[PDB]
Amino acid sequence: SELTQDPAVSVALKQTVTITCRGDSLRSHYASWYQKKPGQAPVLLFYGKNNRPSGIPDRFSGSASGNRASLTITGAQAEDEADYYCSSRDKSGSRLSVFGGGTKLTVLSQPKAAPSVTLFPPSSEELQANKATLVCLISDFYPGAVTVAWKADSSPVKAGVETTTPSKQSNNKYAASSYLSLTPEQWKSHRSYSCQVTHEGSTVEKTVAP
Amino acid sequence: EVRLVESGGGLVKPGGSLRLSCSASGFDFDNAWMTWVRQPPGKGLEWVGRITGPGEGWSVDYAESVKGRFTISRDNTKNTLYLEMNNVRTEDTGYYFCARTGKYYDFWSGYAPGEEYFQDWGQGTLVIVSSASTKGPSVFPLAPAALGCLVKDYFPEPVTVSWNSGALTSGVHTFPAVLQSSGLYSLSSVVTVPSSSLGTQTYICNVNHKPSNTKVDKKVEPK
Numbered sequence: 001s002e003l004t005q006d007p008a009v010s011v012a013l014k015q016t017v018t019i020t021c022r023g024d025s026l027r028s029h030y031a032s033w034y035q036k037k038p039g040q041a042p043v044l045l046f047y048g049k050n051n052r053p054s055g056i057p058d059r060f061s062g063s064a065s066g067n068r069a070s071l072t073i074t075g076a077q078a079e080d081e082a083d084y085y086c087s088s089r090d091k092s093g094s095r096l097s098v099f100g101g102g103t104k105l106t107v108l109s110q111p112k113a114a115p116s117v118t119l120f121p122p123s124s125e126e127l128q129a130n131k132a133t134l135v136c137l138i139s140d141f142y143p144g145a146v147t148v149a150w151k152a153d154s155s156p157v158k159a160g161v162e163t164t165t166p167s168k169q170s171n172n173k174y175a176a177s178s179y180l181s182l183t184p185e186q187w188k189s190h191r192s193y194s195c196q197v198t199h200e201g202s203t204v205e206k207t208v209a210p
Numbered sequence: 211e212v213r214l215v216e217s218g219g220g221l222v223k224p225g226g227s228l229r230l231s232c233s234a235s236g237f238d239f240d241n242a243w244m245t246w247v248r249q250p251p252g253k254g255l256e257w258v259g260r261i262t263g264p265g266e267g268w269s270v271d272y273a274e275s276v277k278g279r280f281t282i283s284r285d286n287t288k289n290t291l292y293l294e295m296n297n298v299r300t301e302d303t304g305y306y307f308c309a310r311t312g313k314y315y316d317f318w319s320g321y322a323p324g325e326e327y328f329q330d331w332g333q334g335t336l337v338i339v340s341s342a343s344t345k346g347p348s349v350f351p352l353a354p355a356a357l358g359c360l361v362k363d364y365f366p367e368p369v370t371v372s373w374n375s376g377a378l379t380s381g382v383h384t385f386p387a388v389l390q391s392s393g394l395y396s397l398s399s400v401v402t403v404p405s406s407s408l409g410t411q412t413y414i415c416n417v418n419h420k421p422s423n424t425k426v427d428k429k430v431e432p433k
Contacts, residue, residue: 030316032327034255041334042247042255042307047327048314085255093322095271097245102254118400120352126360135352135360137400139383162388162396165252169383177385177398 001101002090003031008104008145010112011076019103021069021086028092031069033062036102037082045084046071073105081107106143110172112200115141119195119206122187132187134180136195136206141166143200144174151194151205212236212330214308219335221366222298224393232291232308232332239289241265243311245328246282246293250304251389258282258293260311260326275301298339300391305334340365340393346424347397349417354432355403359415363394364422371399372416408432 003023011017021031032047046052046062059074069086086100115138122132138146144166150157160181166174178195187193187210194207218230232244246258259272261282270282281294291308309328342365352358361369371384381402387395399415417426 028321029323030314030325032325034328036255041331042309042328043331044327044329047312048325049316049319051314053329083254087255087257087328088325089323095323096273097257097260097326099247099255099257118356120358120360123350123353126350129348133350133360133362135358135398137356137358137385137398139400160391162390164386164388167386170381175383175385177400179388179396179398181390 002098003086003088003100005084005086005100005103007101007147008106008143010106010108010143011073012108013078014075016072016074017076017105018073019071019084019105021071021100022067023088023100024067025089025092025094026064026067026069029088030064031062031086031088033060033071034085034087035080035082036085042085076105076107078107078109081105104145106145108143110142113140113142113173114202115139115146115197115199115204117195117197117204117206119193119208121193121208121210122182122184127184127187130184132182132184134182134193134195134208136178136180136197137175138177138197139169139175140171140173141175141199142173144168144176145199146176147198148176148178149196149198150178150180151196153191153193212310214310214330214332216306216308216332216335219306219337221338221340222295223341224298224300224339226298228295228298228337230293230295230306230335230337232293234289234291234308234310237310237330240286243313243326244284244291245309245311245326246291247307247309247328247331248302248304249307249334250301253304258306261291295337298337300339300393303337303339303389305336307334308332338389340389342393344421345394346419346422347417347426349415349426349428351415351428351430352398352400353430354408355405356400357403357413357430358398358400359417359428359430361397361399361417363390363392363396364419365394366421367395368420369395369397370418371397372418373399373401374412374414375416378413
């Protein structure tokens with residue numbers, strides 16, 4: 001990741017938010033910004049020094065200084081809630097292009113809520129079939145932006161982790177699910193398995209054991 | 211006025227080959243630079259590669275995770291952009307886009323390559339990379355409050371999950387499917403439970419998979 005952005009930033013309605021993109025190449029190059037809604041095509045918002053393409057509202061504006069590139073939305077609206085990416089060179093002088101991590105912008109429509117985490121151990125039916133799967137269900141959180149990490153005893157797990165994107169429930173709140181695939185031997189062995197759910201700078205953890 | 215139409219996406223096995231096409235209209239395609247950009251499911255955009263025009267000697271640049279496997283060519287007589295995917299891997303899954311790229315250089319403050327900005331994008335075509343033959347789901351109960359059924363290893367999509375044959379509709383949520391490294395979709399659905407009465411009322415999930423003609427019913431009971 002040569003260009004780094006914050007994963008998710010919330011903004012109140014009719015307020016100003018700044019999304020920051022950082023990288024080494026930004027010291028020698030400008031950056032272009034893009035708005036990406038789920039399913040819809042990405043739209044170019046800002047590029048160069050002070051260039052805004054026609055059609056884009058004037059409330060969008062860009063800036064850069066040092067190794068940082070900033071996109072400013074003055075007076076955010078409901079339709080501005082989408083993903084935002086920066087794009088520039090990966091290295092100073094390189095002929096290649098690279099994108100930023102992405103910033104999930106959320107416009108506050110519902111009172112912010114903390115997640116409810118449930119962790120399920122592998123069923124005895126699944127262990128009989130030479131399989132094992134941990135299910136970590138998360139729901140009733142706002143905004144819809146969480147980061148899930150798995151712990152084997154006290155050691156993080158990277159292999160076999162599958163986590164879905166958050167989706168709105170029927171009660172205007174979001175829900176996300178995560179999975180972790182182990183062997184029956186890796187399950188019965190471990191003292192404890194933990195699902196650490198981090199949301200808005202705070203982490204909720206649930207633990208299961210054989 | 212500018213339009214970009216991608217086509218050619220679909221199911222491909224790992225190591226196989228597939229060709230994507232992007233037709234263009236509304237601008238001068240002969241001198242415009244083109245770029246492929248892909249987005250994996252649930253992840254961010256990724257620059258794939260860029261092919262220049264005849265002024266720059268038809269030069270093509272590729273991403274480091276893409277060199278040696280994908281080939282980008284263009285046909286100015288037909289206003290089409292190509293992306294030949296070869297030795298495809300399971301990591302290449304996602305929506306592929308073509309974009310009309312602009313070229314920018316600020317004179318007073320500027321650098322040697324020239325900052326490139328992608329002006330107009332296409333809608334994108336989906337390329338699923340799985341090795342997996344059609345396979346019915348395996349449903350494992352999740353004991354309690356919260357009650358769930360784990361649909362696992364099902365291909366292709368979709369699976370319809372219903373609880374208590376349509377009687378259960380309070381608090382039910384059916385998550386989005388996830389394509390595993392194996393190439394088989396997996397999915398779960400959870401129901402919030404009164405947390406007081408569990409013995410009196412049964413809780414059965416009804417999993418339906420039309421591609422494999424498999425209907426599964428699993429009783430979920432507490433430990």
